[PDB]
């Protein structure tokens, strides 16, 4: 009876928790039936002349030195609640968050004639909110802010943990420009400034180390039950679901755990857009990612979690669901089994490369292990995520890697050398926050040499 309406509202809210407004309200009239059965088959698009914004905390590691892993959850919830609230008052469409970073887009479902002004107003409001919190709770933190405009193709990829997202080179340009920005001011591009109407603080902000500037401011109930519970497992895991029902929020810390990042390296040059949209290339990417997803179904793949999909990348972790301790087992096999999981990932990409005509797709994979924390962010919206030094170390060491090579951290090298797998020492590369770190490769002269 009314419980059916309760679960209908829950399911609708959970759709809008992971997937935007217009697409949702269009897909509930079953415009496509294959989409409906997948919800138990979709479309992709490509749009021109939209705006994107990124913002990062300054000194994010420092505020997380020796805390209780609970203050972090509360402060992140407060900041992001203010941020997305401001999003509704300024009518901008959020996308997702990457740990310490928050990014949004302007006019993604339908173009808007004043997207740039809204985006810069979001920047100013972000500065105001962060300075208000800094003065209130007395923690000197800053937001590096970057903006860009251009064209981008939007869609939903994967079948597990699938989330709406956008892709183009403009994302990389905006990320790098924010990396080149200064705290307290927005680092803009002339591509954004072609229609700025100079109602603001015009300055020329150039690097001190490409047409850029700086601005300092101014009987269905069982069917619906199955549907809703499947969606709940889609967005959040099982352990958090059972621990949450008797509380409000979630937070946990683990002193040791693995993490792997894996990205397609030669996918960039495959962006020929002679066809209107180039959507078939991303359909192929969908096929490969779906192959990765169906790889998870194996019984020995229960202790491995796909955290999310980052653009075209792939992030996985382990060693956290194993909460039950049995003394007849070694508590350090999770890293090993994840290492094989990476090996079969490479094998599957090799098979797909064999089966596809006239293109080879190589991958970079980076491995790390150590302490970290996990938590849940939204409310009336949801998102599971993890933080720590190890995640950023893994992301850095993976980017300074070589395709078809398993780049591995030195402490992980230590724990893995004695158990049998063979590696060769590559070199030493600087890492921010840790200085020099040694690099090792699992492939052993697999090429001609």
């Amino acid at each position: 009876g009314k419980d059916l309406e309760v679960e209908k509202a829950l399911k609708e809210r959970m759709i809008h928790s992971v997937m935007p407004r217009i697409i949702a309200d269009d897909l509930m009239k079953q415009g496509d039936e294959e989409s409906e059965n997948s919800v138990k088959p979709f479309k992709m698009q490509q749009i021109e002349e939209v705006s994107i914004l990124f913002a990062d905390i300054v000194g994010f590691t420092k505020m997380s030195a020796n805390k209780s892993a609970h203050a972090l959850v509360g402060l992140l919830n407060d900041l992001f609640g203010r941020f997305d609230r401001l999003c509704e008052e300024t009518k901008c469409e959020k996308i997702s968050t990457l740990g310490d970073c928050y990014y949004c887009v302007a006019g993604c479902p339908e173009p808007r004639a004043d997207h740039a002004y809204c985006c810069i107003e979001m920047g100013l409001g972000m500065i105001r909110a962060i300075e208000q919190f800094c003065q209130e709770k007395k923690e000197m933190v800053n937001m590096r802010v970057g903006v860009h405009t251009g064209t981008v193709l939007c869609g939903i990829l994967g079948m597990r943990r699938f989330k709406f997202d956008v892709w183009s080179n403009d994302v990389n340009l905006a990320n790098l420009m924010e990396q080149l920005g200064v705290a307290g001011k927005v680092h803009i591009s002339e591509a954004t400034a072609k229609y700025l109407d100079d109602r603001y603080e015009m300055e020329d902000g150039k690097v001190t180390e490409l047409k850029t500037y700086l601005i300092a401011g101014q009987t269905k109930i069982q069917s619906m039950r199955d549907q809703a519970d499947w969606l709940l497992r889609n967005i959040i895991p099982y352990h958090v679901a059972e621990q949450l029902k008797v509380s409000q929020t979630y937070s946990k810390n683990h002193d040791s755990g693995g993490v792997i990042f894996a990205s397609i390296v030669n996918f960039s040059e495959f962006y020929e857009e002679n066809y209107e949209g180039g959507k078939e290339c991303y359909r192929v990417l969908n096929e490969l990612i779906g192959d990765f997803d169906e790889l998870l179904s194996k019984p020995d793949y229960s202790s491995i979690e796909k955290i999310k999909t980052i653009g075209a990348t792939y992030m996985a972790a382990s060693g956290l669901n194993a909460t039950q301790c049995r003394d007849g087992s070694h508590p350090q096999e999770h890293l090993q089994i994840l290492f094989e999981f990476a090996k079969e990932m490479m094998r599957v990409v090799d098979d797909f490369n064999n089966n596809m005509l006239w293109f080879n797709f190589k991958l970079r994979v980076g491995f790390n292990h150590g302490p970290l924390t996990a938590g849940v962010i939204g409310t009336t919206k949801l998102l599971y995520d993890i933080w720590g030094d190890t995640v950023n170390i893994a992301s850095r060491m993976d980017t300074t890697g070589v395709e078809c090579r398993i780049q591995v951290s030195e402490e992980s090298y230590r724990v893995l050398s004695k158990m049998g797998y063979e590696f060769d020492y590559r070199g030493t590369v600087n890492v921010k926050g840790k200085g020099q770190m040694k690099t090792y490769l699992y492939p052993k002269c697999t090429d001609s040499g």
Binding site: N274, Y275, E276, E280, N355, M356, L357, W358
Partner: protein, 128 residues
């Protein structure tokens, strides 16, 4: 046919280059136009590997003229993508379409232009 593992054997022999196995399998009633998960056809395998002997074996076997993969590409489109000229002429003698374009929306002409083979384009440009 039913339980078309014969299709798998014929395709694996097609891109392996083993002709005697192909004869043996066709002697067993295997389908001429067996297709795989992505939609590849043995003629497209021949275009991949450039075996004119297997091309003629499939032609006498009774293969289709406009076989399309999941990317909707004709064997002529794949040939222009790779660039085996003599296969292109022997295929176009059979009477394939000239102005077609797959789901990527491109004719074989500019494709053969970008792949770096002018021969395919100059041969195709004379059609009517």
């Amino acid at each position: 046919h039913h339980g078309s593992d014969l299709g798998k054997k014929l395709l694996e022999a097609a891109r392996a280059g083993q002709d005697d196995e192909v004869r043996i399998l066709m002697a067993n009633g295997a389908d001429v136009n067996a297709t795989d998960d992505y939609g590849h056809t043995p003629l497209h395998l021949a275009a991949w590997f450039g075996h004119l002997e297997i091309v003629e074996v499939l032609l006498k076997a009774g293969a289709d003229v406009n076989a399309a993969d999941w990317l909707g590409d004709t064997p002529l489109h794949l040939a222009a993508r790779i660039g085996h000229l003599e296969i292109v002429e022997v295929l176009l003698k059979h009477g394939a379409d000239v102005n077609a374009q797959d789901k990527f929306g491109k004719t074989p002409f500019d494709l053969a232009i970008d792949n770096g083979n002018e021969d395919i384009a100059e041969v195709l440009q004379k059609a009517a």
